[PDB]
Amino acid sequence: DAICIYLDESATWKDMKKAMEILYKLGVKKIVVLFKYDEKLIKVAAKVLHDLGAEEAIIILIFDIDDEDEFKKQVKKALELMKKLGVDHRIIALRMTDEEKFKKLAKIAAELGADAICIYLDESATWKDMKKAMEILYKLGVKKIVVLFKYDEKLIKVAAKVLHDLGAEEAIIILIFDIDDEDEFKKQVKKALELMKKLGVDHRIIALRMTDEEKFKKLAKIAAELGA
C-alpha cells in the first residue's frame, strides 16, 4: 500500500521535506504524514506535496488536548488552514483515555469537518480500549475509521476482527515500528504485512520514524520491497 512518515519530534521540517522526497523518488503515490498539530509543519507538508504533485497524499494531525473548547479551538484552526492549502485528505487523530472524553471529542472533530477520525493508542492502551474506541466511532457513524498503533500481533488480530464485525470496509490500520534494530525491523514489517493480508485488511500503512536521511532511506526501501 502506502508509507507514513512519523516526525520524531526531534525532527525538523527540513527532515520532513527530505523524507517526502525520498518516498517520491522510491515511487510512493500515497505519501502520508503524521505529526502533532503544528502550524509550520502543516504549511511545509502542503507545499512539498503540491511541488511533488501527489494530491493522493494525506496529513494526519495528532491532538492531545485536555480542554474541550481548546480542542475545538485548535481543531478548527487546523482544519481551516489545511482548507486554505488545498489539503484534500485531512485526518484528526485522537488518543483513547476516558470513554466519555473520547466520544465528545470525536463528535466535535466530526462536526467541524474532519474527513476521517484516527484512533491513536498509546502504550498505556489495551486491546479492550481499542475495541471500545472503534465501536464508539462506528456508532457515531463516522465514514472512515483509522487505527494507529505500535506494531503488535494481538492488536492487529483484534483490530481486524472488530472491523470485520462492524463491517467497516473503508477502515485503515497504520503500524509504527521501532527502527534502531534494522534486522528486527525487517522481520517485524515482513510479519505484519503477511498477517494483515491473511486477515483481509485491505488498507494498511507502514509508518516510519524520520530520523536521519540515510537511515530513513534504508527503512523505506526495506518496507517497499516487502510490499508496503
Numbering used by the authors: 1 to 228
Can you quote the paper on this entry?
Here, we report the de novo design of a TIM barrel with ovoid (twofold) symmetry, drawing inspiration from natural beta and TIM barrels with ovoid curvature. To this end, we report the computational design and experimental validation of a de novo ovoid TIMB protein, with a completely novel syntax and sequence. The designed protein exhibits an elongated β barrel architecture with loops which are not structurally involved and a more developed hydrophobic core. In accordance with our design goals, the protein folds solubly and is highly stable.
In order to assess whether the proteins fold as designed, and especially whether the ovoid β barrel curvature is maintained, we determined the 3D structure of the OT3 design by X-ray crystallography using molecular replacement with the design model. The experimental structure aligns with high accuracy to the design model, with an overall Cα RMSD of 1.59 Å. In particular, the β barrel showed excellent fidelity, exhibiting just 0.74 Å RMSD over α and β carbon atoms and mirroring closely the ovoid curvature specified in the computational design. Side chain packing in the hydrophobic regions also closely followed the designed rotamers. Especially, the close packing around A93 and A207 suggests that the placement of sterically small residues at the ovoid barrel minor face was a successful strategy. The redesigned β-α loops are free of any critical hydrogen bonding or structural interactions as in the original sTIM11, enabling their redesign and diversification. To assess the quality of the twofold symmetry design, we aligned the first repeat subunit to the second and found close agreement (0.74 Å Cα RMSD), indicating that the designed twofold symmetry is self-consistent and viable. Deviations between the design model and crystal structure can be largely explained by shifting of the helices and loops and may point to potential targets for future redesign. We noticed two main points of deviation: disagreement between the fourth and eighth helices (α4 and α8, which are symmetry mates) and the design model and disagreement between the seventh helix (α7) and the design model (these can be observed in Figure 2d). The total hydrophobic contacts and total buried area across all clusters are increased significantly in OT3 (174 contacts; 7864.8 Å2) compared to sTIM11 (81 contacts; 4067.8 Å2). However, visual inspection reveals that previous flaws with sTIM11 are eliminated in OT3, such as a cavity in the central β barrel and gaps between each of the hydrophobic clusters.
